[PDB]
Design an enzyme around this catalytic site. Structure first.
Site, mmCIF file in Angstrom:
data_model
loop_
_atom_site.group_PDB
_atom_site.id
_atom_site.type_symbol
_atom_site.label_atom_id
_atom_site.label_comp_id
_atom_site.label_asym_id
_atom_site.label_seq_id
_atom_site.Cartn_x
_atom_site.Cartn_y
_atom_site.Cartn_z
ATOM 1 N N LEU A 43 0.823 -1.220 0.000
ATOM 2 C CA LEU A 43 0.000 0.000 0.000
ATOM 3 C C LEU A 43 0.854 1.265 0.000
ATOM 4 O O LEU A 43 0.441 2.293 -0.528
ATOM 5 C CB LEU A 43 -0.968 0.021 1.193
ATOM 6 C CG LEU A 43 -2.073 -1.037 1.206
ATOM 7 C CD1 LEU A 43 -2.893 -0.945 2.464
ATOM 8 C CD2 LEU A 43 -2.978 -0.941 -0.009
ATOM 9 N N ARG A 45 5.015 3.065 1.567
ATOM 10 C CA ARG A 45 6.240 3.036 2.355
ATOM 11 C C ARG A 45 6.577 4.445 2.773
ATOM 12 O O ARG A 45 6.402 5.377 1.993
ATOM 13 C CB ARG A 45 7.410 2.420 1.565
ATOM 14 C CG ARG A 45 8.558 1.941 2.474
ATOM 15 C CD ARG A 45 9.595 1.077 1.774
ATOM 16 N NE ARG A 45 10.254 1.821 0.708
ATOM 17 C CZ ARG A 45 10.747 1.285 -0.402
ATOM 18 N NH1 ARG A 45 10.686 -0.028 -0.601
ATOM 19 N NH2 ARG A 45 11.291 2.054 -1.325
ATOM 20 N N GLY A 46 7.056 4.577 4.000
ATOM 21 C CA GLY A 46 7.489 5.841 4.575
ATOM 22 C C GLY A 46 8.875 5.672 5.148
ATOM 23 O O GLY A 46 9.542 4.670 4.861
ATOM 24 N N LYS A 47 9.317 6.607 6.007
ATOM 25 C CA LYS A 47 10.655 6.444 6.569
ATOM 26 C C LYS A 47 10.672 5.469 7.736
ATOM 27 O O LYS A 47 11.750 5.062 8.180
ATOM 28 C CB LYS A 47 11.309 7.797 6.922
ATOM 29 C CG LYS A 47 12.493 8.126 5.994
ATOM 30 C CD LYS A 47 13.149 9.475 6.294
ATOM 31 C CE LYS A 47 12.580 10.605 5.466
ATOM 32 N NZ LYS A 47 13.188 11.912 5.829
ATOM 33 N N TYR A 48 9.484 5.037 8.200
ATOM 34 C CA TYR A 48 9.471 4.137 9.333
ATOM 35 C C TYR A 48 8.907 2.757 9.053
ATOM 36 O O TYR A 48 9.084 1.883 9.892
ATOM 37 C CB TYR A 48 8.756 4.787 10.531
ATOM 38 C CG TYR A 48 9.523 5.985 11.055
ATOM 39 C CD1 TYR A 48 10.771 5.830 11.658
ATOM 40 C CD2 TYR A 48 9.028 7.277 10.902
ATOM 41 C CE1 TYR A 48 11.503 6.931 12.106
ATOM 42 C CE2 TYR A 48 9.743 8.385 11.361
ATOM 43 C CZ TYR A 48 10.980 8.207 11.962
ATOM 44 O OH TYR A 48 11.702 9.285 12.419
ATOM 45 N N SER A 49 8.242 2.547 7.907
ATOM 46 C CA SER A 49 7.636 1.244 7.646
ATOM 47 C C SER A 49 7.248 1.017 6.197
ATOM 48 O O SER A 49 7.225 1.959 5.407
ATOM 49 C CB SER A 49 6.376 1.086 8.507
ATOM 50 O OG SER A 49 5.374 2.026 8.135
ATOM 51 N N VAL A 51 3.948 -0.715 4.327
ATOM 52 C CA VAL A 51 2.587 -1.088 4.673
ATOM 53 C C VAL A 51 1.953 -1.946 3.567
ATOM 54 O O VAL A 51 2.060 -1.617 2.381
ATOM 55 C CB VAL A 51 1.760 0.202 4.974
ATOM 56 C CG1 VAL A 51 0.288 -0.131 5.222
ATOM 57 C CG2 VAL A 51 2.349 0.962 6.166
ATOM 58 N N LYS A 66 1.942 -3.543 8.878
ATOM 59 C CA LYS A 66 2.934 -2.477 8.904
ATOM 60 C C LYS A 66 4.288 -3.118 9.293
ATOM 61 O O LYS A 66 4.498 -3.464 10.444
ATOM 62 C CB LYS A 66 2.481 -1.415 9.935
ATOM 63 C CG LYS A 66 3.432 -0.248 10.125
ATOM 64 C CD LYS A 66 2.800 0.790 11.087
ATOM 65 C CE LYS A 66 3.659 2.015 11.270
ATOM 66 N NZ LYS A 66 3.006 2.994 12.188
ATOM 67 N N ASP A 154 0.969 13.538 15.674
ATOM 68 C CA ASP A 154 1.043 13.453 14.217
ATOM 69 C C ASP A 154 -0.337 13.466 13.646
ATOM 70 O O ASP A 154 -0.650 12.756 12.691
ATOM 71 C CB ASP A 154 1.879 12.250 13.739
ATOM 72 C CG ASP A 154 2.413 12.385 12.306
ATOM 73 O OD1 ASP A 154 2.525 13.548 11.804
ATOM 74 O OD2 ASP A 154 2.755 11.338 11.700
HETATM 75 C C1 LIG Z 1 12.847 -1.434 3.896
HETATM 76 C C2 LIG Z 1 13.688 -2.022 5.003
HETATM 77 C C3 LIG Z 1 14.773 -1.283 5.466
HETATM 78 C C4 LIG Z 1 15.649 -1.860 6.353
HETATM 79 F F1 LIG Z 1 16.716 -1.123 6.780
HETATM 80 C C5 LIG Z 1 15.497 -3.139 6.833
HETATM 81 C C6 LIG Z 1 14.392 -3.865 6.422
HETATM 82 C C7 LIG Z 1 13.482 -3.327 5.503
HETATM 83 C C8 LIG Z 1 12.367 -4.199 5.020
HETATM 84 C C9 LIG Z 1 12.677 -5.320 4.242
HETATM 85 C C10 LIG Z 1 11.672 -6.135 3.748
HETATM 86 C C11 LIG Z 1 10.334 -5.868 4.006
HETATM 87 C C12 LIG Z 1 9.289 -6.846 3.669
HETATM 88 N N1 LIG Z 1 9.182 -7.754 4.790
HETATM 89 C C13 LIG Z 1 10.010 -4.741 4.754
HETATM 90 C C14 LIG Z 1 11.008 -3.940 5.273
HETATM 91 CL CL1 LIG Z 1 10.529 -2.634 6.314
#
Ligand SMILES: Cc1cc(F)ccc1-c1ccc(C[NH3+])cc1Cl
Ligand SMILES: Nc1ncnc2c1ncn2[C@@H]1O[C@H](COP(=O)(O)OP(=O)(O)OP(=O)(O)O)[C@@H](O)[C@H]1O
Ligand SMILES: Cc1cc(F)ccc1-c1ccc(C[NH3+])cc1Cl
Ligand SMILES: Cc1cc(F)ccc1-c1ccc(C[NH3+])cc1Cl
Length: 327
Positions: A43, A45-49, A51, A66, A154
């Site tokens: 859906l 992506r941001g700086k923290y997750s 989704v 998330k 927020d």
């Molecule tokens: C985008 C990210 C950044 C990171 F530094 C470490 C993990 C991840 C990450 C890797 C794969 C997925 C799908 N399970 C999601 C994330 Cl947040």
């Protein structure tokens, strides 16, 4: 040095609740089964997750996952504890489960799914009545979380999911939320630029729940005046100047003088002298259908420099602007 400040409501909540309630570092996470969930589509992506829409295969129901990016472990535990504390509260998103994502090696928060109506469609077509109705629903969520000793920090439209077909609203993204402890100095790098309270913009750290009420006023102003965003700063400094062009510089100086705050001297080249404007100045033929004397009075009571002077969420619920809303 700065004069201390305390909230005028809910100061004692985290005192009278047991330490296990707010001491999020001591919280032990109850891990669920990652195999119960199958990711369907990304859906955003941001700086923290990152989704995802997913399906819980034990009951075939849509969920939202998330997956957290690795950040200070304290931020992850804080969001989990806040979500568990608030679960079941009015219009608060429900945290359904917490699992360890096998690929990211980080926690993945599983939430109830909200069939979020297109944001552009809501901004363009919500009626005067609908704006009042949804504002009342957001106030239920904010009074609940503030009564529970938590500030969201927020509040903005992207963090309010609305399933317009079912008149269902949920306040989401509790990743920046914090427990309110009187006398605590908080990080001012919270909230999105256009929703930042003057307390953040002048680096006053002893803020409280009332920061959420400023952000709510920014949302209402943009919506009723058809001016997205209402305070359109180019950066955090110009953000305060845009506020001062509406609220005036004399009330800004009264605010910083009350708290013995000094503006950053970089403001000398950009702030200037501005009168307080009357809210009617922002009314025109393309937004008059969304404005009323009650909307302006309510807005005037949220958008105040002095964080201690703003309406609390519970006082806001009593306002004449909501008399027309079916309860
Ligand atoms: C985008 C990210 C950044 C990171 F530094 C470490 C993990 C991840 C990450 C890797 C794969 C997925 C799908 N399970 C999601 C994330 Cl947040
Ligand atoms: N519970 C939820 N229901 C629906 N969409 C959600 C939920 N939580 C987050 N989102 C979506 O995640 C994204 C955030 O990036 C947005 O597109 C937002 O709509
Ligand atoms: C219902 C409402 C009322 C406002 F006064 C300002 C914004 C909004 C709003 C608009 C779109 C969305 C969808 N994410 C959410 C909200 Cl709260
Ligand atoms: C004419 C006016 C003046 C004000 F001081 C505040 C609100 C209003 C007003 C009254 C009714 C409507 C119709 N929706 C619109 C406005 Cl701006």
């Amino acid at each position: 040095g700065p004069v201390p400040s305390r909230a005028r409501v809910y100061t004692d909540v985290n005192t009278h609740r047991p330490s296990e309630y707010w001491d999020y570092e001591s919280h032990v996470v109850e891990w669920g089964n990652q195999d119960d969930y199958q990711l369907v589509r990304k859906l955003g992506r941001g700086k923290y997750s990152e989704v995802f829409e997913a399906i819980n295969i034990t009951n075939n129901e849509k969920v939202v996952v998330k997956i957290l990016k690795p950040v200070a472990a304290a931020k992850i535990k804080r969001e989990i504890k806040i979500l568990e504390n608030l679960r079941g509260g009015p219009n608060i998103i429900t945290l359904a489960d917490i699992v360890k994502d096998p690929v990211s090696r980080t926690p993945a928060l599983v939430f109830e799914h909200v069939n979020n109506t297109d944001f552009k469609q809501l901004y363009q077509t919500l009626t005067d009545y609908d704006i009042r109705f949804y504002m009342y629903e957001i106030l239920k969520a904010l009074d609940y979380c503030h009564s529970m000793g938590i500030m969201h920090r927020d509040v903005k439209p992207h963090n309010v999911m609305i399933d317009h077909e079912h008149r269902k609203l949920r306040l989401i993204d509790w990743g920046l939320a914090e427990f309110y402890h009187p006398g605590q100095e908080y990080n001012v790098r919270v909230a999105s630029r256009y929703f930042k309270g003057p307390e953040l913009l002048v680096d006053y750290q002893m803020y409280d729940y009332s920061l959420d009420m400023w952000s709510l006023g920014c949302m209402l102003a943009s919506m009723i005046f058809r001016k997205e965003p209402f305070f359109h700063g180019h950066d955090n400094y110009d953000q305060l100047v845009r506020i001062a062009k509406v609220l005036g510089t004399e009330d800004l100086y009264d605010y910083i003088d009350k708290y013995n705050i000094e503006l950053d001297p970089r403001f000398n080249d950009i702030l200037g002298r501005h009168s307080r404007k009357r809210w009617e100045r922002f009314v025109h033929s393309e937004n008059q259908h969304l404005v009323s004397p009650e909307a302006l009075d309510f807005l005037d009571k949220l958008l105040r420099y002095d964080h201690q002077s703003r309406l609390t969420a519970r006082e806001a619920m009593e306002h004449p602007y909501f008399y027309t809303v079916v309860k």
